[PDB]
Amino acid sequence: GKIYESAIDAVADVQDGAQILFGGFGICGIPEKMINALKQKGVKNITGVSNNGGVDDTGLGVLIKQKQVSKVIGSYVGENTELVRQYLEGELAVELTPQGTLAEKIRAGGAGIPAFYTPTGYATLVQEGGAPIKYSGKVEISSEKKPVKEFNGKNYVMEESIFADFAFVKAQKADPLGNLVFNKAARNFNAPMCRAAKITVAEVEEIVPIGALSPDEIHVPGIYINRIFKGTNYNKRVERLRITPNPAQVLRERIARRVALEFHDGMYANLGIGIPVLSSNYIPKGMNVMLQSENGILGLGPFPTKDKVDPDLINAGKESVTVVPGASYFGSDDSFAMIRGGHVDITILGAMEVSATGDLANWMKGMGGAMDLVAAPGTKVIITMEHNARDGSPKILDTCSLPLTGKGVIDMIISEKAVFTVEKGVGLTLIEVAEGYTVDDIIASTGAKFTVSPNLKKMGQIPV
Amino acid sequence: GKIYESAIDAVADVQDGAQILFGGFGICGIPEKMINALKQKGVKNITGVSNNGGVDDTGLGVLIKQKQVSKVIGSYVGENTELVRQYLEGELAVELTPQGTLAEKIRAGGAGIPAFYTPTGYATLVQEGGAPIKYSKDGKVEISSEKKPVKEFNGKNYVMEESIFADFAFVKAQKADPLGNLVFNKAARNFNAPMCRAAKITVAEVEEIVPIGALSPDEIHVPGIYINRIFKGTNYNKRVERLRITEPNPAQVLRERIARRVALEFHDGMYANLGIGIPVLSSNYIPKGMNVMLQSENGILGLGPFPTKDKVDPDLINAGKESVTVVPGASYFGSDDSFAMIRGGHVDITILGAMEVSATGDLANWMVKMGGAMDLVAAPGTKVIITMEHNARDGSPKILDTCSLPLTGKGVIDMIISEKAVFTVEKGVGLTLIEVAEGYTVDDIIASTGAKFTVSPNLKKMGQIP
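Above: the input entities. Below: the C-alpha cells describing the complete assembly.
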C-alpha cells in the first residue's frame, strides 16, 4: 500500500492505450473519484474492462462521454445509451463476455493462469465467434472462434485470462499497508479486479490505522494494492429505487404462483428480475429458501422500507434490496464459481424466445448472468415468460430466430397459459394448462410441436 | 446445511472407493473428529486428497494406518513413514502434485472449471511424466504419471492441469451458524477454504456453533451453500509439529554470513517468501525500521518471529510447520489465494535453499513437492535467490554444469549466494562471479564449483549487513 492525498497524483503515470479494470456492478461500488481523476487527466484510447458502462455520465460512463475509451470489455452495456450510440456509429469497440467468464478471466489473470475452460458460452456465438465487436456496417472487427475440449463427457470452451495495466477499485476501509475491506454488495468485481493489474488503485471511505483491520477480517491483502485514496463526498445513488387491480398483474402472479411450487426447504435458487423474483413472495412461511444474487450475495430479502434503502445493497437488476438473517457477501468471481460449480439448485429466468429442444435466446443489451446460469451442471433451469409477444406472435418456437443464450438447456417452461417439461435436445411435453384455456388455444399460440401429456392437468397454484 | 450431534451419522453415506478431500496443512486445521468417525466406520479404498499425510496416526495418517486409503493425492508425504512404507511395498498409490497446483485443482473443481494452465511443473517430472504412482507388491511400476499437455501463451510455457471435484470434503473451522456459514481461525484455514467448495457433499467440523446472525455477512469466510453437514467437536488434540520459542554455533557461523549477505537484497516495501533454514535466518537482519512483509504459502502475509512460550498457537505456523507469530497488519487467507498471489507474480522476491543448482539457473530438490518450491520459482517477475553451502567438505561441488537430480525448475534462478561467493545468473546461458567472501580467491572458487563461469572483471568482496 501507500496513501495519496490527491487522486490526480494517483493516476499521474497512466499512459494512453492502457488496459484498465474498473470495479463496480451497475453504479454500485464504482471508483467515482479515480474516474474523475482520469477524466481530468484526459488519458485517451483506454480499453476499459468493466462489467457495465455505468449509465450516462456516471461510473465508466464519465469516460465514455469524453471519448476516452476506445474499447469496452464487459457483459452488459444496455443502460448506457451514449455507449451504445458510439458502438453503432462505429466510434467504439465492444467485446461482450458472459459475466461469469469476465469474473474468472480476471481472477485467472491475477492468479497467473493464462487460460482455463468453462461450459459457459458453448454452442453460442461466444464459442462460435462472428459477433460484431467494431463497426466503421461495415463490421470491422468480429469475435474469434474459441477452442473447445471435452472433459468427463461434457463440453467446454477455452477462455484466456485478463491482466491489465491498472485496476481502479472501490472499497469501504483501508489500512496504510493496503489491506482492504468492502461493504456489502459493493464488492462485486472490485474483489477480483484488485488482484489482476500491474498497478492497483483503491479508493475508500475510511482509512484506519494498522491493526484496526484484524487479520481474519481482511477481504483483500495489502500486497495486491499499490496506491490508496480516501474520497469524501460520494454521490452514491440507487439506479432502480424499490420500496415496500390488475389483469396483467394477475397473469404475472399466476405464473409466479406456479413456479413457487418448485421451491423446497433447504434450496438454493437464483431468480432473474421480473417474474422469477415475484415468486419469492409466495414462499410458504416455514420454508427456507436461500436466494443467490450474481452480484455477490447469498440471502436476498425483500425491498427495503424507505428508511433502509442502501446504495451498497442491490440485486442483479440494480434494485435496492435487503438481506435475511444468515446472509453472506462475496466477490463476483466467487459468485460465479458457486454457479458454474453447480452449487445452486435451481435457476428461474425470463426469455425473449425458447425452443422445442430446450434452447434459450435472450441477449440479442447483453447476456450478463443468463449464459452462466443455464450452462451450470446439475442445475434446474426454469423459464418464466408470457406465452406470446403482445401481437402474440409465438415465443415458444421450433427453432429460435435469435442468437442463443444456451443450447438444450431449459428443463421447464411456465407461461400464463401452460406448463411444459423439456427433454433437452429432443422436445416439449405439455403437462399443465391454466384454467379457462384449452389445449387448442395452446396449440394455436405455440409455434413448436409438442406432445400432450397423457394425464395433463390444470395448472397448479400455490396457496395465499 | 444442517447440524449433526453425531459424527457417525455425518459420514453414514460415505461408500468404499470415495474420493475425499481432507483439509489441513501438516497437522494444522485438520478434521480430527470426522477422521475418527471414518476410522470408526471402516470405509475402505479411499482416494484421499490432502496436502500432507499428517504424521504417524494423526490427520490423514489415522486412516492410512488402518489401510483405509488406496491412493493419496498431495504435495508432500515425507513425515508419515507408514505412508511411505505402504507406497514402496506396493499397498498404496501416490500422486504428488505441486502444492499450488493442488490448491488450484481444487479451487477450479469447485468452481466448475475442469482444467486450467499453470507454469508450475513445466520442464520437470510433473510435465514430463514417468514418475511411479503405484508399485505392485513385487514391483515393478504398475501405474506411472502421464505426460501433461503444454501450451504457450504470450511467449511463456504452461502445463495443462485437470481439476479435482470429490465425493466428499472433510473440513475444519472455528465457528459455524446453523445455515453452514463458516469462519476459520488464522492459518488453520489453508486447504479447508478451497476444499469445502469442491465436493458433492461437505462436512465441516467446528469448535463453536453460533446462532444465525452472529456471523455477520461481511465476516463470513465460507457461505453456507458450500456446506451440507455441521459437527461441533470438543476435545481437540491440537499440536504444533515443530515447536519454536524465543526465550528472553559451528555450521551456524557460515549460515549467518550467507544470511547477512542476502539481507542486503531487502528494500522497504518489499514482499518476500523465505524458505526454512537460511532464508528465514536472514529476516533477523532486516534493518529496523525497514518494512518487509513476509509471505507464507500456508496462507499468511505478515510473518513475525517465534512466539514466547506463553503465546504458542497451534493455529499459527509457518510453511515449515513451526509455531510462529504475525506482525501488525497481517492477513490470513486460503491456500488457493496464497498460490494465486505467487503464481500471479505478486511476491517480489523468493529466497530458498537447494541440493544442487546449475550454470544456466536450473534448481533441484527431491532425490511434487519442501514447500512450495516449484510454484515459487515458476512465478513470473519474481526474483529467485538461492542460499546454499557452496560444496560438501570433500570438495563435492553443488554448483554444477548440469544437475544430476530431478529439477524443481529450469532456468529459474537469478542469484546464488554461498559462504564463499556470489553469482548472478543469466537464465538459460550462464553464471557470473560477482563477489567473493573475505579470505577466498577466484582460484578457490574455480576449484570448488563444477560449473564454468565468467568472473566479473568488476568483482568485489562479499558484502555483509550490519
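Note for the figure: Chain A has twelve helices and 28 strands.
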